[PDB]
Ligand binder design. Structure first.
Ligand SMILES: O=C(O[C@@H]1CN[C@H](C(=O)O)C1)c1ccc(-c2ccccc2)cc1
Ligand SMILES: O=C(O[C@@H]1CN[C@H](C(=O)O)C1)c1ccc(-c2ccccc2)cc1
Ligand SMILES: O=C(O[C@@H]1CN[C@H](C(=O)O)C1)c1ccc(-c2ccccc2)cc1
Lengths: 442, 442, 442
């Protein structure tokens, strides 16, 4: 039934296109001048509503899916599957970062152009920042792993601020911990996996609880169906709002065309050559057909710019349309979302290479390897914190000591490239799931 | 067994009467002068303890009751029942507001009297307020519906404050969102209903989870029995404390007797003529007998002045004493508490008409309809936020541009009329439940 | 199998000893000068990680264990068991406080010595404090009992701050309530017990839910096994960090040797004479053998200095190694942790007697009884709040009006005696559990 099957894909693609058209027409016809902030809020509000709906269920779906998936195969096979999955995610993120270096080095987006100016963008506010240390970031990562409280971890994460409690002499900023807002999805993932392993360690005592969590996840999936049918309206209004919130006639594109083209080309090459090649090599099944099977979550990622929001829609589409195993999907795809960020590592590395290319820095071999490794680790470093969309580039440049004086340049255009990043991240998650499904099948 | 059956009703009526007598005697014999703030806190503390007990269980009871009630009848009948229930609540709230107009217009409580003075009450602090816009209130309503996180929604709700982030020129206050304290019971209600519909959409997978939630609610009901047996002491001490906290020899009654009489008469006429007439018309069964069946929750509402607190006691009494169906009770009565506020719409409209009557405003037909509709919507507008006992009148007067210069007059006497409001709200909820029980039975 | 059975006990004792050796060697070899704050954080971080792990599971384990234990015996036997348990905890805490008086009165640690000076310790900051009233502390106790919301009670507790809302004349600080951080484990304990009683009041409706909670607790116990195998590393690094954070060559020991010896001797006499004597008297079974059965939780308490953290390890060890009944363990040991603080009452009383002994106060009989009773009540007074490690001594001295001018003396050495306090608290909990197991068996 092609007409009914492809209806959703048609609807969300039409939603994205019509949202772009609506926003461009509104901005050209007057935009904010004809709109006002109140009508801007009402115009963006369906987007905020879709993101409120899809952030409501990631906690049930992630927790109960991992508990229902971990306790479906014995811990030996689970350990092997988790290890090969982490290896796959690490390799894909690393290949993405290397592709970013190879593109930004060649196209040279940091050539002398309008982007050389940074007074308007920075205006002295770029240097002023928390300036989180790399060690403190890794410690906050390993403290959001193994949370102090599960309930608080359902909406809070640990962030190490810096006070000035060294008045005795030579004032040095010292770390203090204070829980902030944002889900600790990494901690919940680890707790859930460990729980499911515990229930598989038990036998008849755990059958009730596995039945509970599988039923709960199936109910949440039934909610996901209806959220999915709502999603095109939210995507349309969200995209229209996010191109009405800033003019996009071509001024910022004319400013940073090489950098944005480098990022989008890197994302497409990662998402249409590298990972499809890996899938074909391993499972020997049409990767582009599989990619067409998941267009609706990809479009939702492009609209939403959060891997959080698109994941329920994705797990529904992968388990339903494509012939991916239910337990493998449950175990892998949440872990893919919180760890694999191929696009994030990609455009972080490309941004670093761009800001280094302007001012003519060297970056011969050692600094290249450094940016690769710290981008690969920051794939998960940025994962626990939702606020740090591109904030993690500052700590990278602190590690390797580059000019952070114009990091605010990307914040004007962060809303664009992060979308394609989200697309590639969910794509890499699904391709890992398919590969590991075939590996477990063999 | 009349002696054992009516014991609780006798006990709570005696508690209210003895609390009034205790507070009046203490205030006459010296009150605070003989008491001190520390003994005032210890004297009110049983009231605070009862409200802490009854706010502990509304979350379990509401969530699990709606999940156990929604998934007891098919979604078609559920949709019809929900639609006729919302229509009933809307019509009752609208009739209440019209009754408020009809009374305040006739009795004319805003005649020239001591209430004309407002310097002592306002003293310039009335105008200073957040001044929340109507659109922003509706957006916060639809964002507390569809919460971002369920756990946070168990004790937090979304409130749009206003910052001054327009330093570029012509400083205009802009909205920012920041979650505040207070349960998001509307969001939990909607999520729970949707969940129960999902479990009914499933079949054998959901039987476990329905059995879980029904068992959990029955356990919470068993707690409610013991809280109910404690409740008269809390009501007595609470009422005594709330008339010791301000002198009530008759000064404020002598000031606002017409307004308070108008509100209480409106509440009684709504609760003893209109809704009993509707019940008799539809189900043809003794409405005043049914009203006598539920005296203990009504007295608890009068003491507590929160529809939150009285609801567990009410659902216990309605399912136990009166012959109302268990599933219909579960589905309707929580939704009644968070949506139907007949008394709130009533005294909000009466307060508006009173403040308009002083200063001799017109309010011919269009403004009357405006106050009716905005009161009907603010019945649920004030529902998500517990702090806004009468705060929502300011945004109404912002919509229709009346003198808010003396809104602080009612805050001295808000503690009185809100009690009768709570009584009428729970009464309207039960009468809707009985009507819809008979409709489903037919 | 002695070699495999005693492996854990060997490992944690070796961990404590090696942590002491590591910290002393690091402090002697340069300590902070060779370390830096960043490496100090990385060196303490395994300790923080163990405490994050053991605070993650106390909520599941406490809640589900009490629900699974309360609903295993009928409410009559439960009421008797709870009453005899509270009587036992009260008597043991009182005996501990009397032992503290008897030791501090005899050894006279407040003799004229270096400890007479307090300018360096206090420096005027001792008097400045919240100065919480005793009545307000008891009210906050009874409001953390019977929480307003269960979810918030999973990570928040009620603390009455004091504002200055008496500008009308004679500015007097007035209480305001605002929820703060810290688990409301007392409220969760009471709610859980009451819930389990409700499920036992029900019959077939509750069997599912009891099976759920028992399965959930068993899963959490399975997590506890792995946390237990990790624990020695955390204990070693934590102890090393907490003796590297301050020099302990003997300066503070040379300052307060009599006071610390009094506290440790009181703890050992309570833990090795009084309670073993009671156990032998009642159950007639080797108490020191039972004490050897639980060495690993005692060492964990000595390392961690929190009865929160050690309790999962303790309930595992008591149910597994020693022949204590599962239901009795579940019901008693959590209640022991949140109520019985023998060591806390002990060193609080000893600290009071020490600060009274310096400056030559009388403390004949009435003040002795006062300190005993307020210490016995503050055993649970300090229990709800984790921040108040020794903060509760100030409100005691407010009750009985002693010099609080040098309360900051103990804060330098609070990290030492609180460890032995935690050891004795968990020890008293287990001994109560064993006694009541034998009583129920008889
Ligand atoms: O902050 C993030 O990363 C940046 C945000 N936009 C870019 C993108 O989403 O690709 C990169 C982030 C967002 C979402 C989740 C997530 C949460 C719950 C379940 C599953 C996933 C993790 C990390
Ligand atoms: O703020 C409110 O409305 C005013 C407060 N006092 C008046 C009254 O209670 O009638 C009007 C409010 C209070 C309570 C709940 C509620 C919460 C949970 C379950 C069920 C109900 C909704 C809204
Ligand atoms: O603040 C406390 O008491 C002082 C802290 N250090 C000393 C000690 O732990 O002995 C005394 C405290 C700590 C922990 C818990 C606890 C929490 C959850 C489950 C079980 C228990 C109660 C109260």
């Amino acid at each position: 039934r092609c007409l009914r099957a492809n209806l959703l894909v048609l609807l969300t693609v039409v939603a994205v296109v019509a949202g772009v058209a609506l926003g461009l027409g509104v901005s050209g016809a007057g935009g904010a001048l004809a709109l006002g902030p109140e009508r801007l809020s009402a115009f963006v509000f369906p987007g905020e509503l879709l993101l409120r709906l899809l952030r409501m269920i990631i906690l049930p779906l992630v927790v109960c899916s991992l508990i229902g998936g971990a306790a479906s195969l014995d811990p030996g096979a689970l350990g092997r599957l988790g290890a090969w999955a982490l290896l796959f995610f690490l390799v894909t993120t690393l290949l993405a970062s290397a592709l970013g270096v190879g593109l930004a080095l060649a196209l040279q987006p940091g050539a002398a152009s309008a982007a050389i100016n940074a007074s308007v963008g920075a205006a002295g506010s770029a240097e002023n920042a928390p300036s989180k240390e790399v060690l403190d970031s890794f410690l906050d990562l390993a403290r959001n792993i193994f949370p102090s409280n599960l309930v608080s971890a359902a909406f809070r994460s640990y962030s190490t601020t810096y006070e000035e409690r060294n008045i005795t002499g030579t004032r040095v900023k010292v770390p203090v911990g204070q829980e902030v807002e944002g889900m600790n999805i990494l901690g919940l993932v680890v707790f859930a996996i460990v729980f499911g392993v515990a229930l598989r360690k038990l036998g008849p005592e755990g059958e009730l609880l596995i039945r509970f969590f599988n039923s709960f996840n199936e109910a949440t999936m039934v909610l996901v169906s209806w959220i999915m049918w709502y999603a095109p309206v939210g995507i349309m209004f969200l995209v229209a709002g996010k191109i009405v919130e800033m003019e996009d006639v071509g001024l910022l594109f004319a400013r940073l065309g090489k950098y944005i083209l480098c990022c989008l080309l890197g994302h497409a090459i990662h998402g249409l050559l590298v990972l499809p090649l890996i899938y074909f090599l391993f499972t020997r099944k049409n990767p582009y057909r599989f990619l067409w099977g998941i267009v609706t979550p990809l479009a939702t990622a492009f609209g939403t710019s959060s891997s959080s929001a698109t994941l329920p829609l994705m797990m529904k589409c992968v388990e339903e349309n494509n012939g991916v195993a239910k337990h493998i999907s449950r175990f892998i795809l949440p872990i893919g979302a919180t760890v694999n960020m191929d696009g994030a590592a990609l455009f972080q590395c490309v941004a670093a290479v761009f800001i280094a290319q302007l001012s003519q820095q060297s970056l011969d071999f050692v600094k290249i390897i450094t940016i690769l490794v710290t981008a690969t680790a920051s794939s998960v470093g940025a994962a626990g914190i939702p606020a740090g969309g591109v904030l993690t580039l500052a700590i990278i440049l602190e590690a390797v000591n580059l000019p952070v004086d114009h990091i605010s340049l990307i914040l004007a255009v962060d809303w664009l490239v992060d979308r394609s990043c989200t697309v590639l991240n969910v794509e890499g998650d699904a391709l890992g799931a398919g590969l590991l499904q075939n590996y477990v099948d063999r």
